């Protein structure tokens, strides 16, 4: 169903699903809401941010 | 000095220059400053966005 899961710094996780869709969990795998225009990093050290329920990468 | 240019599908650019300064241009080529929080689309397609001075690409 997730085509792809952003590992964020916080423990907190970022799905993407085959339908287009996005969900975000915290650390304990509680559905979170998921913020708009904030700066999110990844385990690997990649910055996101959400604008429009899309996932924009620092380039 | 222009390090990156992206063209924008309203007729207008986006520059980095080699210092990391960040400027829009308009149709006109009227410097202006870089837009931020806002998503612009190219002309190849892709969507940008600015925030913090730095530029985040579509994933
Ligand atoms: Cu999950
Ligand atoms: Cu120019």
Partial sequence: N???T???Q???KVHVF???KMGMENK???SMNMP???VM???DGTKIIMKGNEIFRLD
């Fill in 41 to 43: 990093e990844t385990r």
């Fill in 36 to 38: 708009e225009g904030k």
């Fill in 2 to 4: 997730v085509v792809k």
């Fill in 18 to 20: 085959k339908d287009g």
């Fill in 28 to 30: 304990f795998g509680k």
């Fill in 10 to 12: 916080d423990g907190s």
């Fill in 6 to 8: 952003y590992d964020l």
